[PDB]
C-alpha cells in the first residue's frame, strides 16, 4: 500500500481487485483450482478370483 | 478378443496344446482319463463363463 | 443311462448359466460405477465429502460462482462449513488421506503434493482461470521490462527444467493410463493353476497304477 | 439380467441411492422443518428429493 516493496513475487492469483490496483505483469504460470482425491487402491482378491 | 488379454490367449493356446500332448502321452502309455476330462471341462467352463460375462 | 445322462446335462446347463449370470452381474456392477467420482462433477453424488481451504482462493471463487455444477458444490460446502472446510493445505491433505474426502486446491500445489507422495491423485484440473506473476502498484516501465524478460525466458528452454526439478522430488511408481477392459492375469490365473494341479495329479495317479 | 437388476441397486439405500432411484418411496412431515430445509439450500441430490 505504501509502496515499500518495489517488486512483489509470491503465489498470487490474478484477481479483479488485484489487477485493478496493481497492473500485474504477464502471468508467470497459468493454473487454476483443481480437485484432490485419494488414489483408488486395487482390491486384489487373489489368484483364485473366479 | 478384447475381453481376454493377449497373454491369456497365449496361456489358453499353450494349455490346449499341453492337454492334447498329455492325452496323447496317456494313450501311448480309465480313472485318469475321467479326471483329465473333468478338469479340462471345468477349465473350459470357467474360461467360457468369464469371456461371456466380460463381453456382456 | 439315458435318464442320468440327461439330468446331468440339465444340471450342467443350469450351473453354467448361473455362474455366467452371476459373473456378468458382478462385472457389470463393477464397470457401471466409475473408479473415481464424477470428474469435477461431485454434484448428484452427496456421499464423498468435498471442500476447500476456509476463506481461501478456491473458497472465494466458489462463493462467487453461478455455474450449475459449482453453485451446488458451494451450497454443500456452506451447509457443512465446520466439517468439509479446513484451515490449512496440510490439514486438507491429511483429511483426504484419513477418510473419504475430496479437496479443492490450486493446481500447482496439487501436482507438488502428488509428486511428493504417490498415495494421492489429481482428478480434473484447470477448472478456473488464474495465474501467478510479479506486480508493481504503479504504472512503472520496469514491470514491462520484467514481462519482456518473461517472454524471452520462455522463448528459449530454461523454464521447464527448473520447474520440473523443483517438483520432481522423489520417484513415483508407474501407473496405468489407458488400460483396457480385458481380464487381468491375477483375475483368471486361478483356473490355470487349478488346471495344472489337476493335470499333474491325474498324471501321478495314472503312473501310480 | 435379473441378477444385474437386483445387484445394480445398492442393498442399503443411502443419502444418494434414494435420489437416483424411483422404486423406493420416501417422505416426511408436511413442512415439518424437514422439507423446509429441502426447498432451500439447493443440493443436487437434495433438490431431487425435494422435487
Ligand atoms: C481402498 O479402496 C476401497 C474401495 O473404495 C476403500 O475402502 C478405500 O478407498 C481404500 N481402503 C483402504 C485404503 O484401506
Q: Which helix (H) or strand (E) holds C136?
A: none
* Cα(C85)–Cα(A3) distance, integer angstroms: 34
Strand partners, B29: none
Residue minimizing CA distance to atom 7 of ligand 1:
A41
Measuring CA to CA, which residue among C128, C154, C134, C156 is closest to residue A26? C134
Q: Minimal CA–CA distance to C46: which of B25, B30, D47, A37?
A: D47
Interface of A with C in 7-36 (CB under 8 A): 7-15, 18, 21-36
Q: How many B/C residue pairs have CB atoms within 8 Å? A: 87
Rounded to 5 degrees, what are φ and ψ at D21? -90, 165
Which residue's alpha carbon is nearest to atom 1 within ligand 1? A41
Ligand 1 center from residue B5 Cα (angstroms): 26
Please tell me whether residue C194 adopts helix, strand or coil conformation.
Answer: helix
Q: Is D13 helix (H, G, I), strand (E, B) or coil?
A: coil
DSSP labels, A9-46:
-S-----HHHHHHS---S-SEEE-EEEEE---------
Backbone interruptions in chain D following residues (C to N > 2.5 Å):
none
Q: Using a CB-CB distance cutoff of 8 angstroms, which residues of chain D are in contact with residue C72?
A: 42-44, 47
Give the separation between CA C63 and CA C73, rounded to whole angstroms: 10
Q: List the resolution, Å.
A: 3.8
Please tell me the distance in Å from B13's CA to the nearest CA on chain C. 12
Task: Tell whether B14 lies on the interface with C, counting CB pairs under 8 A.
Answer: no
Would you state the cell numbers that stand for residue D35, as one nine-digit string? Answer: 422439507
Is D34 annotated to bind a ligand? Reply is yes
Which contacts of C93-96 are long-range, i.e. CB under 8 A and separated by 24 or more positions? C93/A36, C93/C120, C96/A36, C96/A37, C96/A38, C96/C120
User: All 3 cell numbers of residue C68?
Assistant: 450449475
Beta carbon of A41 within 6 Å of any ligand 1 atom: yes
**How far is CA C99 from its chain centroid?**
15
Report whether C176 belongs to an annotated binding site. no
Amino acid at each position: 500500500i505504501d509502496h515499500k516493496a518495489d517488486l512483489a513475487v509470491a503465489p498470487l492469483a490474478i484477481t479483479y481487485v488485484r489487477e485493478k490496483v496493481i497492473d500485474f505483469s504477464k502471468p508467470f504460470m497459468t493454473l487454476g483450482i483443481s480437485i484432490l482425491y485419494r488414489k483408488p487402491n486395487g482390491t486384489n482378491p487373489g489368484v483364485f478370483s473366479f | 478378443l478384447n475381453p481376454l488379454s493377449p497373454d491369456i490367449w497365449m496361456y489358453i493356446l499353450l494349455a490346449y496344446l499341453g492337454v492334447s500332448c498329455v492325452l496323447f502321452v496317456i494313450a501311448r502309455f480309465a480313472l485318469s482319463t475321467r479326471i483329465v476330462g473333468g478338469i479340462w471341462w471345468f477349465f473350459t467352463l470357467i474360461i467360457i463363463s468369464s469371456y461371456t460375462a466380460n463381453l456382456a | 443311462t439315458r435318464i442320468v445322462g440327461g439330468i446331468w446335462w440339465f444340471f450342467t446347463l443350469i450351473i453354467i448359466s448361473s455362474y455366467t449370470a452371476n459373473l456378468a452381474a458382478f462385472l457389470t456392477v463393477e464397470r457401471m460405477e466409475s473408479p473415481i467420482d464424477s470428474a469435477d462433477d461431485l454434484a448428484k453424488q452427496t456421499k464423498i465429502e468435498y471442500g476447500a481451504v476456509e476463506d481461501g482462493a478456491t473458497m472465494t471463487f466458489f462463493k462467487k460462482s453461478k455455474i450449475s455444477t459449482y453453485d451446488k458444490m458451494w451450497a454443500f460446502m456452506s451447509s457443512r462449513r465446520q466439517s468439509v472446510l479446513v484451515k490449512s493445505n496440510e490439514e486438507g491433505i491429511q483429511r483426504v488421506l484419513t477418510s473419504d474426502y475430496a479437496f479443492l486446491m490450486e493446481s500447482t500445489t496439487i501436482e507438488f503434493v502428488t509428486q511428493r507422495n504417490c498415495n494421492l491423485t489429481q482428478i480434473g484440473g484447470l477448472i478456473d482461470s488464474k495465474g501467478y506473476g510479479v506486480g508493481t502498484p504503479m504504472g512503472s516501465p520496469y514491470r514491462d521490462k520484467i514481462t519482456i524478460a518473461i517472454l524471452q525466458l520462455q522463448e528459449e528452454g530454461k523454464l521447464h527444467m527448473m520447474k520440473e526439478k523443483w517438483w520432481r522430488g522423489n520417484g513415483c511408481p508407474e501407473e496405468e493410463s489407458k488400460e483396457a477392459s480385458a481380464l487381468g492375469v491375477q483375475n483368471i490365473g486361478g483356473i490355470f493353476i487349478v488346471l495344472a494341479a489337476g493335470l499333474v495329479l491325474s498324471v501321478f495317479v495314472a503312473v501310480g497304477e
